Amino acid sequence: NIPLDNAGLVKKTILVGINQFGGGHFTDMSDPTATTANGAIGRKDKVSASTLRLTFAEKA
């Protein structure tokens, strides 16, 4: 089984959003493939959260 551990693996932790306006990066709001608009959690690779950390990685 794959062990779960953030220490030693991740170096930067990002806290995003207080409301659904900031929470749209982790749901179907930022998911192009998602069809619903009920705030369902979309695929992590397609939401803007993945792009948020992607531009962070290349810049830093």
Side-chain angles (χ1 to χ4, degrees):
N1 291 324
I2 312 298
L4 177 59
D5 53 329
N6 297 21
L9 178 55
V10 298
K11 315 302 296 181
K12 295 300 177 299
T13 303
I14 311 299
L15 275 294
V16 178
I18 199 184
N19 283 10
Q20 54 277 9
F21 299 92
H25 302 275
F26 304 92
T27 177
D28 53 353
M29 298 292 101
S30 57
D31 197 332
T33 63
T35 62
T36 61
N38 304 89
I41 302 301
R43 308 199 307 178
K44 297 182 179 180
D45 64 329
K46 304 302 297 179
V47 296
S48 62
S50 62
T51 64
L52 174 60
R53 79 165 190 175
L54 183 60
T55 178
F56 209 147
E58 49 91 6
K59 287 297 182 179

